[PDB]
Design a protein around this ligand. Structure first.
Ligand SMILES: Nc1ncnc2c1ncn2[C@@H]1O[C@H](COP(=O)(O)OP(=O)(O)O)[C@@H](O)[C@H]1O
Ligand SMILES: Nc1ncnc2c1ncn2[C@@H]1O[C@H](COP(=O)(O)OP(=O)(O)O)[C@@H](O)[C@H]1O
Ligand SMILES: CCCCCCCNC(=O)CCNC(=O)[C@H](O)C(C)(C)COP(=O)(O)O
Ligand SMILES: CCCCCCCNC(=O)CCNC(=O)[C@H](O)C(C)(C)COP(=O)(O)O
Lengths: 267, 266
């Protein structure tokens, strides 16, 4: 009975491994007390921890547990998941889009943190609440899917008008930039929520394509729970990566890269 | 009288020049018709245009005018201003933070667009209105200055708690990340406004420090009107640039590097 736990700022990713049988459990960081209660209830052969609140679990647990650096764990697990899903990538940039975004570069041997930004899921949830007053994650993300950004976001062509723009006119010039041109029109909580996800997506992708260029790689692997139930963010990210001449990748159970990695670093 | 005009998405920057003494005019893009009216009533030896709405002016004007690419003009006017103010920088990343942000690299000869982002002044104004129903620029920018982001932004140390973080704990982990931990506390339009400027600043600086590393340079020059009346954004940007081992620079009349550039170009 082997168990790996990535206790982040928002979600706790549990990976149970029994006689070559993987289980993917996901409880909130908000309800960490219930995760410790559960863990205490059973004998685990080897326990491996990673992420922010990994110490919290370690303190309140009455069982020994090894602790690993999330940056190294995420990379390990991603390697495992990519080759399992038939991806043989020599090099790549991997974006861990969690509460906040952590940018890494993998050179076929090891990872290196090459950047990070505070535009992740925590912003989708945070700014999402201030613009819709919705606290439920599913509800917020689902609401956002068919929202219109035309009245909210400003495009390059809107500034350049008839004039030939020096970069693609369809591109977003200014996020929320159109808001003051549409003071008459009602800003729907859907339209507004779409625009939050749009800016978060565009920032993560811009940062990701920049370091992909820097470390001379065309492969970008996107991981983290921010992608769960948010198909709009996935398309926002995916479409821009392609437009920036890069190859986007989404791994199944990629938000468990951390947790999986913890199990395969001890041995 | 030689005149340069950078007609952007939000502001029109006019720099008129008459015998080594300059004039720095600002008129809104909203009131472009008034700018054309004035120019038609002005005795201009040489007219140079740049930016988004440069064509609009050129069409409605009854005087010929040379049109230049803003990416090249900005670079030109910036170097004139840089040198004049005693900055002799070999190489430098320059961020033109206007309605939207554009990122360039200057190799002691010419510039190259190396990035861009939709997180500029247009976002401060746009998201600023949705979070405060304030349309007045000055008002929006002055309210933000005395705003607290503790209840709004999430820091690395908040996630890592007592555990030693793998990057500085004081750093912003997630913008608006704290909002759901403070649902009890009611979010002041000033606290909210500082968070908008904070994220805009942090995105521009992160992107700027990344390309500064990429094109092997430590100098970062920040320009655009987004810095006007917004001391908070300036400090947000300035402090992070330094923390990332880079040299930040703010040039006097930097938001005119486009209208200056246009004059001294061909
Ligand atoms: N059930 C959920 N509850 C809360 N946030 C969720 C949920 N599913 C996905 N998310 C998203 O995932 C983000 C956290 O990402 P995650 O990869 O788990 O990061 P961390 O490891 O820092 O907790 C949240 O900010 C939110 O966008
Ligand atoms: N009086 C003002 N009214 C509106 N915006 C202003 C004003 N002064 C400065 N700004 C700021 O400058 C930004 C535009 O910057 P600017 O350098 O003119 O770029 P652009 O060329 O895209 O117009 C605005 O979005 C706003 O944040
Ligand atoms: C002045 C404040 C500067 C903040 C600029 C943004 C830099 N921030 C980051 O690189 C942190 C981004 N997020 C993360 O690394 C993850 O959420 C992590 C804490 C590792 C989990
Ligand atoms: C969804 C995919 C498209 C959006 C990706 C964001 C990239 N956008 C940009 O680089 C435009 C940034 N803005 C600018 O350079 C200026 O404000 C300008 C258009 C020159 C005026």
């Amino acid at each position: 009975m082997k168990v790996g736990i990535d206790a982040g700022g928002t979600l706790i990713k549990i990976v149970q491994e029994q006689d070559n049988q993987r289980t993917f459990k996901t409880e909130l960081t908000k309800n960490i007390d219930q995760v410790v209660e559960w863990l205490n209830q059973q004998q685990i052969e080897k326990l491996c921890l990673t992420g922010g609140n990994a110490g919290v679990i370690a303190e309140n647990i009455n069982i020994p547990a090894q602790i690993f650096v999330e940056f190294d764990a995420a990379s390990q697990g991603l390697g495992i998941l990519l080759k399992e899903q038939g991806h043989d990538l020599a090099d790549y940039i991997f974006a861990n889009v969690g509460t906040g975004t952590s940018l890494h570069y993998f050179d076929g041997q090891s990872q290196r943190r090459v950047g990070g930004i505070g535009t992740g899921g925590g912003m989708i949830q945070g700014l999402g609440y201030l613009l819709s007053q919705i606290t439920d994650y599913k509800q917020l993300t689902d609401m956002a899917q068919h929202g219109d950004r035309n009245t909210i976001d400003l495009k390059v062509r809107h500034i350049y008008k008839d004039t030939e723009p020096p970069i693609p006119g369809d591109l977003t010039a200014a996020n929320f930039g159109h808001v003051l041109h549409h003071l008459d029109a009602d800003f729907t909580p859907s339209n507004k929520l779409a625009a939050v996800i749009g800016v978060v997506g565009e920032v993560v992708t811009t940062m990701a394509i920049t370091v992909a260029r820097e470390f001379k790689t065309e492969n970008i692997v996107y991981i983290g729970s921010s992608f769960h139930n948010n198909a709009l963010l996935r398309k926002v990210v995916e479409d821009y990566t392609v437009l920036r001449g890069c190859k986007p990748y989404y791994v199944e159970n990629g938000a468990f890269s951390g947790a999986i990695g913890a199990l395969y670093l001890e041995k």
